Amino acid sequence: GLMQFTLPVRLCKEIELFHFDIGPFENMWPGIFVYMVHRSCGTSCFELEKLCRFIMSVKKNYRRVPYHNWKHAVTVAHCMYAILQNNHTLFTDLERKGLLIACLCHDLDHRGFSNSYLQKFDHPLAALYSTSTMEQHHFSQTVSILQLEGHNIFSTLSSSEYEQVLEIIRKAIIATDLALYFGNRKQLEEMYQTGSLNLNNQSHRDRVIGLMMTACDLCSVTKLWPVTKLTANDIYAEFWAEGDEMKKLGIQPIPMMDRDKKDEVPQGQLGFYNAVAIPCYTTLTQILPPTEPLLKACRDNLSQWEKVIRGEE
Ligand SMILES: CN(C)C(=O)c1ccncc1NC(=O)c1nc(C2CC2)ccc1Nc1cncnc1
Ligand SMILES: [Cl-]
Ligand SMILES: [Mg+2]
Ligand SMILES: [Zn+2]
């Protein structure tokens, strides 16, 4: 009950910032996440004995892949924690509890392959779920872990607060299907420029929470350049692996994934930053002004990639 988590000074300070890196020590990530829940939500809203057991069962079910791993989960959780603590009044007791859990579980059991590769390989999960394949798998794995004995961190919610919270987590996890992000932002832009955006419209929150999730999931691009550049390797190791696996099915992969077309990365980083990231954080700032630091940092990194092209690094 009275068992606060504290962090080393530098961590206690830097964690509150959007561009925080959770560091190379696996064994502190669970404390960091508990710390975030206790500050973001209250010291009460999860039984520690149950949270810690959930966290470790969650960690246990992330695989040792270069990018879509346990560190990515906690990175994305952290970025969501930065948004919640800078938009304190806007979000319900439950929205805070479910979103942080949503972020931690958003990529459960990821194998390091796109929805595309599941379809062209004809993986069972592509048969069981026609769209948002991995994302429906991830939400599925979340419910499995919640139904293990001694793992129901939501135990004390009512029947209806429970279905309210499992439904926040489900749409939140689905929204990390970047194929849905594009429509979701277009509609949110159209509703902010026309002035129809209304955070009391449930279907409107849904979309906003949807985009926060895109923003949190993409937040490796909102870090300091040395973090961003070193993450870019990890995401490209999965990309080139999947390219290798496309070639094995006798399909030439998009160039993003062809490890012969390594020369073309910086241009593809530009393309990504212009098509996805700058828009996401632009629209997210419009809707949630205090999240501007994410846009600012995103822009800085786009600039850093323009210098790579221009042979200045
Ligand atoms: C949709 N579209 C155009 C592209 O997907 C894209 C295209 C050309 N090149 C790269 C692309 N995507 C990425 O680079 C990227 N993608 C994801 C999510 C799986 C989609 C997350 C992060 C990314 N970058 C990054 C860099 N550094 C740190 N973290 C992440
Ligand atoms: Cl606070
Ligand atoms: Mg994912
Ligand atoms: Zn992710």
Asked whether residue 178 is domain-assigned, the answer is: yes
Asked if 278 and 299 touch (Cβ cutoff 8 Å), the reply is: yes
Domain of residue 55, CATH code: 1.10.1300.10
Q: Which residues line ligand 1 (CB under 6 A)?
A: 178, 218, 220-221, 228, 231-232, 235, 256, 268, 271-272, 275-276
Asked whether residue 17 is domain-assigned, the answer is: no
Q: Which residues have beta carbons under 5 A from ligand 4 (an ion)?
A: 107, 217
Nearest by Cα to 79 from 109, 56, 104, 46: 104
CA distance 195 to 177: 27
Which two three-digit tokens encode residue 83? 């948004």
Give yes or no: 68 in active site. Answer: yes
Amino acid (one-letter) located at 224: L
Per the structure, the count of domains in the chain is 1
**Residue 230: alpha-carbon gap to chain centroid:** 18
CA distance 289 to 283: 10
- Backbone phi, then psi, for 218, in 5-degree steps? -90, 5
Q: Which ligand is nearest to the CA of 228?
A: 1
Contacts of 63 by beta carbon, 8 Å cutoff, 6+ apart: 69, 109, 110, 111, 112
SS (H, E, C) the chain: CCCCCCCCHHHHHHCCCCCCCCCCCHHHHHHHHHHHHHHHCCCCCCCHHHHHHHHHHHHHCCCCCCCCCHHHHHHHHHHHHHHHHHCCCCCCHHHHHHHHHHHHHCCCCCCCCCHHHHHHHCCHHHHHCCCCHHHHHHHHHHHHHHCCCCCCCCCCCCHHHHHHHHHHHHHHHHCCCHHHHHHHHHHHHHHHHCCCCCCCCHHHHHHHHHHHHHHHHCHHHHCCHHHHHHHHHHHHHHHHHHHHHHHHCCCCCCHHHCCCCCCCHHHHHHHHHHHHHHHHHHHHHHHCHHHHHHHHHHHHHHHHHHHHHCCCC
The reply, when asked if residue 106 is annotated as ligand binding, is yes
Amino acid (one-letter) located at 225: W
Asked whether residue 3 is domain-assigned, the answer is: no
Resolution limit, Å? 2.7
Asked if 303 and 294 touch (Cβ cutoff 8 Å), the reply is: no
Asked whether residue 266 is domain-assigned, the answer is: yes
Pocket test residue of 65, 118, 185, 276 for ligand 1, highest count of atoms within 8 A of CB: 276
Asked whether residue 4 is domain-assigned, the answer is: no
Domain containing 299: what range?
Answer: 28-310
